[PDB]
Design a protein around this ligand. Structure first.
Ligand SMILES: Cc1cc2nc3c(=O)[nH]c(=O)nc-3n(C[C@H](O)[C@H](O)[C@H](O)COP(=O)(O)OP(=O)(O)OC[C@H]3O[C@@H](n4cnc5c(N)ncnc54)[C@H](O)[C@@H]3O)c2cc1C
Ligand SMILES: Cc1cc2nc3c(=O)[nH]c(=O)nc-3n(C[C@H](O)[C@H](O)[C@H](O)COP(=O)(O)OP(=O)(O)OC[C@H]3O[C@@H](n4cnc5c(N)ncnc54)[C@H](O)[C@@H]3O)c2cc1C
Ligand SMILES: Cc1cc2nc3c(=O)[nH]c(=O)nc-3n(C[C@H](O)[C@H](O)[C@H](O)COP(=O)(O)OP(=O)(O)OC[C@H]3O[C@@H](n4cnc5c(N)ncnc54)[C@H](O)[C@@H]3O)c2cc1C
Lengths: 645, 645, 296
């Protein structure tokens, strides 16, 4: 018999925090049903370079995000906006969840997004303590080596932002209003004082800096290691090697390899939970007080439908045997970030000397900065607070080498064989597309549910007058407009790059190859000759302009639109699957029953401003507080860390 | 308690036959653990047109091979030979298995393949009775409507095969040696006597015909329906609506929704089997005599590793708790068919009249014939019996409309918007690539195991002398050579098509667009000027010819090789996962224990000559005989059908 | 033996409501003798477009009101007033009765007709609660798309009704006296406030509007379905697939395919009822308290 009252389902980035601190300051019984094992000895997972295939045997050079021993492999339905191609994205399969197989970034999400996007009691001032706690527990590290590329970028940014402060435009992309009127770009000289983008009081929404924060820890020996949720919260110091708590944590049980099917359910008080061991046997943990769901964005709603709470007509049509509650918002409104790709060529006598120290390393991992921007001026879909508050919209990145897939490499002909390349990425942060998740089999936890996520749907003109069908075209074309404005943003930095590199004693030439520059200069001409109505030319049938200028600009837009659909990566940064206000209240509690609550990244009512690791950790901390009834994690001193072994 | 001795795992195309006839002529207890439900009322699955989205609501127009309510969705590892892209292929999820979601073809596999490719006791003469039985039980139907396109093709084929009979070449592609020296091409006039490619004594390996055989049955009303393994063997007449046998079949139990985890195992006699109901509860069926595995190519080896029999070092490394037998051939040697794609354009006054009646229908389903060919003359990888026996290598097809993916459509610019197109396909039948399957989680039946399947790997020249590194280049480049020879075959029919269409009173013009003709005429010139050594120019570094002719031919090969990698579909026709001689004997029995046997398409030691439905049905019939001890299905009169309701 | 005391004969539009709510708030034994089966899976009956022959195979394009698998087919005697021609009209044959094969409209019947046409205890004020209940249970839906034809009609109607209000005639056809003297014609512009002809207090006897109320329900997927008495009151949630009640409704039995011949009768207390199963056998349900007739 396996009676319990604390029942966590999944040791993700939020499961570990919740379980660790809940067991630290409470003496209930805790079972953590995890379905993965602890890769404490696997050299590929500990060494960060193993992320880049140092240990793969020659036959099978793949990344852990694809390997089925490491990650769940859902396959999404075809994307009607990207030529009906189906993507595979990964939830982790290990203690610590996705953190075991991630890229280790720590962007906390600025003041603006939570203050004006999150409900009462979750404002930036109400949770920033939790964020301090988690960034303290990890204690990530930066790189401190010089690279002339980042300096070039940041001085070009200063050049351009000085024009932007003048001319009085209130929402241009290099503007910050917490710093008076000017974002604090990091200085450019030996040992300049650093800019920390994750500042405690969220001063910097827009800024420029020079390296990122990754979850490594330099060891005394000289080798760097992965530092993740399983590594910190649940290691040999607290949990027995068989899955039992140690001393102070004695009421803490970890069933490592256990997939939960559903939560058996009585009255409206869920009473029991079923799991399947590796040896094939069902068991049942009895539930006395509560159950916890921390099983990722994708699988959490599936757990809920199989449990019994969800849309009755659909679930009955597929044939789940038990119905509990009719909540037709279960698992709705998924979101994610997106990232197109852009290349540059270099042509000069000493360009090889201009790009040294750009190889990925154990501290940088193929990152060289290099900024974070806001809305472009000519963006039409901005919130009403754009004028008085600055928003985090574009997440600039930079890397050496080639990032485009080998097919695009064949098409453009630009290969890493000819060494003149580096990539700039504008990771959209406020991406619009919204999708939903269902199940197709009421049987067991699969590896692929129904996932619909359509991105770049083009507009179909109708016979309605243009005067009331522009404001549906706008909202349909939103992602295209945002991606194109990001293209403009990257395009209009490269010339300041040319200037500052020529003037810093470097004789090289910079010209974008993918996408080809000529398209972009034509776009710039069209933009600054057509004004805010530049986006009216996505649908040439509505403008009714036969002048060759507008015809050529619309043609340019048309041929350009191929590249965000083709040359991009889909971000793993899923979120927002069981949002507050949709299926749960501000207490994370599930609406319709009394003893089930969801406490993971699915509950976020809005996607945060960065790589969505820290937000889920925060949610775990806060949910610990909510179940506890009193704030202790908020009141713990910042400099107490869990032990590291 | 659920004691049993007949235990079938999976109602595939082979599970249904086995269970139905085993229960017909025997009085044991039979449990059929299936994991799917019976789509007897679903209009999309019954109406064959529903395969082509007549009933899909507008939001979700997808095909059942993608829908997770209908099919398992494994995702293969990236294909290093096709620009590292990952494919998703479908095993069915319903009673009747893949047959529920298939394209309904019935190519039985000729004399040659089984006689010279299958072990003793499985020769063509030893099993052809079973094939007669199954093709009788289905009784498929053909189309009998005229279409001038097929006539054009078949008369061009006659024209060319008359040259091929002369010139004395013994392995050219339009040659048949069972019909003396000449394949029997179907006649071209009103109501000509038909050629049945599935002849009872396998006379026709190579032939030309005019329509295919599909699993429909015209109803009295006027509407056609799907006719499949679940429909025939297990319908309301024999099995209760709760899953119980009727009268004569009273010892027949169907647990519709049950996923098997493993087979609990004692001594070396497997004793028990576990499954998971929809309501989440484990159960256990006790095993008294045998267990049966009919769970498809992909999942069968996975069942075996989770059971305990397989490579010890690997399974121990991932951590399965029980080890039984060390058989490092489990789940090795997967195979499948492949199908590139080719387009044609038409330009003439009455071409629209030349292509009427090519829309897909309830009897044809987008098929218009139109042949089946053998090895091209200049193929270097032929078996030693090529000269004295003719082999089935290329499966010609034809269809109206455009088949290339929308991205290829953008690149070539050829769309179905301009109505001048039809497609010719050369479905390779003796495809070389071989892969293998493993598992990554010893927990439960997932939806995606490790699958490695690499197709178009290019050769990497070394410092070894050419004189002993040509016969590794040959075997590495085999698939490229075969695909290119198929390109030659399709190319050199279109001109006889031009001739016979112009001479049959039709004034139209035919010219291939994808791939572009100019490449192909250059290839033809190079082929007939370079001889059998045309394939030496895949690796220009080895020939050491600087003459511009060879340089241009090698360039043409290089640029052509892009299209089989890009513009093709992967066939769902998996096979050969637990072959005879690898892990089982000629009795299908698993080597190492006494009471487990595999009886599905995974056991085939070689892929058959066609759409691999009939072969698995045959294997089911034969395994019924093997367990029975006496041949009754072979001795049943051919004209007894199971009842249809 | 099939003893009973609640005995409903026919699951029409009135049989379903009666049986459902009678079994909800009472614990007697209920047998519902229906003579039809449940077309829960038949795509033609669920999809409203199937009413207009989307699924008919080419040989037999007919409407369900004619098909004998769906509807009873009485033939009336020749109409001496219409050149002695004989009509065929349909009662439904399914659970839910005629609702299964209908055209899905919801006009409730105004204040006037029941108040001055129906006896004491059935006036509009005495029953309007029940009407609220049923229109609530269905929750029909409207269309919200623009069409210039309806606007043309409604503005012409306004034009003419303005003359009719003047000239003092007290019974002309575009007059309403609950709205003072003028029927409230629906406005004509983008998103004008709608006029609901089935108002709760029966203000509008005469009015103009722009779309009707039909028994569909938009699904999450994008496909509309029939919503009818069998669909609401008697579906898989309450009644077993063999015809037995579920839990709270455990005292509820549905003999799906049973035609009642007569009610065998003793003294002046009817005692028993006979029906004929599909397999041809008579049976007899004993009657303890009452019998119910809801057979059209
Ligand atoms: C390729 C990749 C790159 C990434 N890059 C970054 C990056 O640059 N920066 C960054 O900050 N983050 C990165 N991440 C991490 C990611 O952005 C978040 O850290 C992630 O969303 C963590 O959320 P979570 O822990 O709540 O969810 P998860 O980690 O998905 O939690 C799910 C957990 O529950 C378990 N589980 C699931 N179903 C069951 C079941 N039925 N029974 C029991 N257990 C179950 C799973 O095994 C898993 O451990 C990356 C991740 C990936 C895969
Ligand atoms: C898109 C598509 C197109 C096709 N086109 C053609 C065509 O043109 N011609 C043709 O002849 N055939 C076609 N086929 C069918 C295919 O070629 C064969 O019919 C197929 O290999 C049948 O083999 P099988 O029945 O042995 O395997 P399967 O049908 O895959 O048998 C597996 C069965 O076992 C069940 N099962 C799996 N795991 C478990 C478990 N753990 N517990 C219980 N049950 C389980 C599955 O639900 C399934 O019912 C097509 C199939 C598809 C998907
Ligand atoms: C073609 C058509 C169009 C329609 N259009 C509309 C419309 O636009 N708007 C609208 O509001 N309504 C419409 N209707 C429906 C109709 O106006 C009413 O809904 C109908 O009168 C419902 O009344 P009822 O349920 O009491 O009668 P019925 O539905 O006729 O009740 C009789 C029921 O009892 C069963 N029965 C009969 N005899 C026996 C027996 N001996 N034993 C057992 N069971 C028996 C029958 O099978 C049937 O289920 C339409 C109907 C039809 C046929």
């Amino acid at each position: 018999n396996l009676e319990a009252d604390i029942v966590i389902i999944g040791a993700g980035a939020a499961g570990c925090v919740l379980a660790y601190y809940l067991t630290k300051f409470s003496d209930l019984k805790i079972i953590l049903l995890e379905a993965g094992h602890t890769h404490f000895n696997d050299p590929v997972v500990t060494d960060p370079m193993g992320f880049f295939g140092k240990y793969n045997p020659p036959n099978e050079n793949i990344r852990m995000s694809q390997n089925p021993s490491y990650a769940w492999q859902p396959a999404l339905e075809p994307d009607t906006g990207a030529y009906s191609m189906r993507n595979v994205v990964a939830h982790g399969l290990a203690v610590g969840g996705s953190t075991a197989i991630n890229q280790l970034n720590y962007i906390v999400g600025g003041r603006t997004v939570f203050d004006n996007d999150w409900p009462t009691g979750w404002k930036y001032d109400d949770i920033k303590k939790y964020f301090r706690r988690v960034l303290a527990d990890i204690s990530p590290i930066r790189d401190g080596t010089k690279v002339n590329l980042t300096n070039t970028i940041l001085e070009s940014m200063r050049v351009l932002a000085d024009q932007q402060v003048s001319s009085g435009v209130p929402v241009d992309f290099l503007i910050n209003k917490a710093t008076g009127g000017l974002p604090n770009i990091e200085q450019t000289y030996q040992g300049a004082p650093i800019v920390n983008l994750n500042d405690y009081e969220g001063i910097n929404s827009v800024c420029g800096f020079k390296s990122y924060y990754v979850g490594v820890n330099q060891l005394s020996d000289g080798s760097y290691i992965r530092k993740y949720a399983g590594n910190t919260y649940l290691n040999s110091y607290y949990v027995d090697s068989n899955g039992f708590g140690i001393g102070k944590f004695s009421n803490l049980r970890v069933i490592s390899d256990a997939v939960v099917d559903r939560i058996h359910f009585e009255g409206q008080r869920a009473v029991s939970v079923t799991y399947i061991d590796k040896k094939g046997n069902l068991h049942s943990v009895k539930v006395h007080k509560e159950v916890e769901i921390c099983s990722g964005s994708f699988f959490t709603p599936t757990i809920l439908q199989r449990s019994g709470i969800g849309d009755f007509s659909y679930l009955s049509s597929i044939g789940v045997p038990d119905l509990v509650y009719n909540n037709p918002l279960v698992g709705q409104g998924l979101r994610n970030h997106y990232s197109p790709i852009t290349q540059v060529s270099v042509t000069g006598p000493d360009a090889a000397a201009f790009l040294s120290n750009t190889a990925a390393g154990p501290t940088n991992m193929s990152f060289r900065g290099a900024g974070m921007l806001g809305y472009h001026k000519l963006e039409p879909n901005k919130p009403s607070n754009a004028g008085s508050v600055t928003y985090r919209k574009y997440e600039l990145l930079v890397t050496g080498g080639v990032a485009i897939s080998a097919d695009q490499q064949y098409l453009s002909g630009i290969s890493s064989s000819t060494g003149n390349y580096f990539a700039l990425i504008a990771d959209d942060i406020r991406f619009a597309p919204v999708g939903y998740i269902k199940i197709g089999t009421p049987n067991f936890p699969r590896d692929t549910p129904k996932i619909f996520f359509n991105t770049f749907v083009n507009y179909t003109p109708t016979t309605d007058p243009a005067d009331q069908q522009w404001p549906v075209a706008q909202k349909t074309l939103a992602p295209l407009i945002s991606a194109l404005l990001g293209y403009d943003a990257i395009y209009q930095i490269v010339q300041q790059m040319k200037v500052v590199a020529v003037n810093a004693g470097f004789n090289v030439t910079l010209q974008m190859a993918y996408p080809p520059n000529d398209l972009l200069v034509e776009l710039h001409n069209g933009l600054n000759t057509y004004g805010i109505n530049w986006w009216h030319y996505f649908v040439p049938s509505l403008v009714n302009d036969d002048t060759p200028a507008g015809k050529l600009f619309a043609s340019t837009l048309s041929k350009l639109s191929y590249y965000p659909r083709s040359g991009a990566h889909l971000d793993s940064h899923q979120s927002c699957s069981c949002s507050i206000g949709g299926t749960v209240d501000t207490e994370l509690k599930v609406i319709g029953v009394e003893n089930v609550r969801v406490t993971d990244l699915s509950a976020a009512p809005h996607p945060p401003g960065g790589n969505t690791w820290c937000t889920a950790a925060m949610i775990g901390a806060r949910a610990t507080d909510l179940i506890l009834g009193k704030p202790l994690v908020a009141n713990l001193p910042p400099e107490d860390v869990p032990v590291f072994t």
